[PDB]
């Protein structure tokens with residue numbers, strides 16, 4: 001059907017049902033906004049598998065999400081939401097641009113997980129923003145902002161344990177949420193190694209840092225995460 | 234044993250008194266921009282800043298704002314209460330300008346229906362990065378009550394200041410505060426309030442502030458002299 005949006009990582013098509021979309025995961029990887037864009041064979045299948053797996057578990061734990069089913073190698077069937085243009089970032093450990101903002105090593109545990117908002121606007125390079133900025137931008141009000149925080153946290157509780165159980169330290173991650181057709185906020189987008197940090201106990205980067213920093217082949221390590229994930233239940 | 238240089242800043246030196254709790258702040262003829270890049274000595278800047286700051290703090294004190302100000306003491310110096318600084322630059326915007334304008338790719342000079350408060354962690358080595366409330370806590374700078382007190386006091390201070398500069402024809406675009414714990418552990422307003430840490434436009438959009446130095450739009454002491462001349466008419 002029709003291409004609604006062509007992203008850096010996914011293409012979004014319509015279905016015959018108004019409220020439903022098909023998300024198609026691309027073999028494209030990007031870093032730093034640009035440049036740093038590369039086609040990587042089989043990255044879309046891995047990411048679609050990993051995301052379909054996590055969302056299914058989230059659905060089972062009672063998290064409201066856009067996930068309905070995985071459909072092919074590359075595609076999944078999703079609830080259509082109106083996206084809240086925030087990247088909601090949760091950190092358990094210092095890493096990346098938090099290590100840069102505060103001049104501190106990566107890998108220091110944070111006694112309380114910190115959530116950060118970034119305005120999802122590529123033209124602005126998704127700047128870091130505060131709650132008053134959220135309101136200014138008319139993105140969400142006080143209650144909804146509180147809701148986004150508390151839901152991201154509850155989701156972190158689940159995920160951190162699951163990854164722990166397969167031996168990966170969930171350092172940080174990035175969520176997006178959206179208004180469903182009945183105006184409820186639900187989790188959407190994707191949860192892949194594209195938008196989380198995963199270290200093993202030896203500190204190996206089992207995520208997109210491998211690509212950002214040129215540490216090795218992206219799909220080898222994504223494949224390892226996939227294999228580990230299937231040992232869950 | 235009365236007068237020791239506790240600290241040398243970009244715009245003020247601070248010295249001991251014989252009274253433990255009191256400090257003399259000495260304003261300097263030095264201007265900086267882009268955390269240390271464009272550094273110039275500017276004759277007369279120190280007295281203007283000391284003058285404007287002495288003035289505004291005195292009016293703040295009379296309005297009931299707890300501050301560090303005791304008395305202007307010479308052209309250059311002022312007698313302050315010694316605080317333990319809260320390393321946060323608390324910024325309030327009334328209008329869009331500067332790095333807000335950049336962050337949101339929006340023009341300078343748009344009115345903000347509600348004034349916006351922003352924290353920058355006051356650390357020169359990290360270039361005073363923008364931070365959120367949870368970052369304040371991670372940093373162990375202040376807990377939830379103290380954070381809301383900072384906001385609520387900056388806002389009230391804004392309510393006064395915006396009215397005062399209005400009465401003499403300048404629009405108060407934005408400013409930056411610092412606060413600190415006093416000898417009794419209460420939070421008070423400290424540092425300086427001068428055109429160095431506020432934006433001031435006249436009705437023609439003229440820059441009556443440090444932007445004149447930053448953007449190289451005219452001689453700095455000329456403009457600050459103008460603000461000083463106008464402030465004396467609220468007197």
Ligand SMILES: Nc1ncnc2c1ncn2[C@@H]1O[C@H](COP(=O)(O)OP(=O)(O)O)[C@@H](O)[C@H]1O
Nearest residue numbers: 007008009010012066078079080081083188189
């Ligand atoms: N369930 C959904 N309904 C509608 N739009 C969605 C949904 N999930 C994700 N989107 C949007 O689809 C696009 C997916 O493309 P992606 O490649 O991830 O975008 P980006 O380049 O912003 O990372 C994003 O704009 C994302 O917010």
Ligand SMILES: Nc1ncnc2c1ncn2[C@@H]1O[C@H](COP(=O)(O)OP(=O)(O)O)[C@@H](O)[C@H]1O
Nearest residue numbers: 242243244245247301313314315316318423424
């Ligand atoms: N009442 C006070 N008590 C103690 N220290 C203060 C007080 N007011 C200001 N300071 C500190 O004096 C220092 C010197 O001032 P300044 O030149 O403005 O330094 P900066 O380069 O940090 O702007 C600043 O670090 C400031 O926080």
Ligand SMILES: Nc1cncn1[C@@H]1O[C@H](COP(=O)(O)O)[C@@H](O)[C@H]1O
Nearest residue numbers: 096097098172173174194195196197
């Ligand atoms: N995918 C994404 C896009 N913007 C941020 N992230 C994710 O959010 C976390 C925080 O990243 P950073 O430290 O670079 O801000 C990392 O897991 C990163 O993949």
Ligand SMILES: Nc1cncn1[C@@H]1O[C@H](COP(=O)(O)O)[C@@H](O)[C@H]1O
Nearest residue numbers: 331332333407408409429430431432
């Ligand atoms: N003086 C200072 C040092 N750091 C911030 N400021 C002040 O903070 C306000 C916001 O500036 P910006 O938009 O550049 O963050 C301006 O009035 C500016 O002088």
Ligand SMILES: N[C@@H](CC(=O)O)C(=O)O
Nearest residue numbers: 008009126174189194195
């Ligand atoms: N990096 C984000 C989206 C983006 O900023 O382009 C993600 O992985 O979903």
Ligand SMILES: [Cl-]
Nearest residue numbers: 127128362363
């Ligand atoms: Cl920032």
Ligand SMILES: [Mg+2]
Nearest residue numbers: 007008009010
């Ligand atoms: Mg994306």
Ligand SMILES: [Mg+2]
Nearest residue numbers: 242243244245
């Ligand atoms: Mg200063």
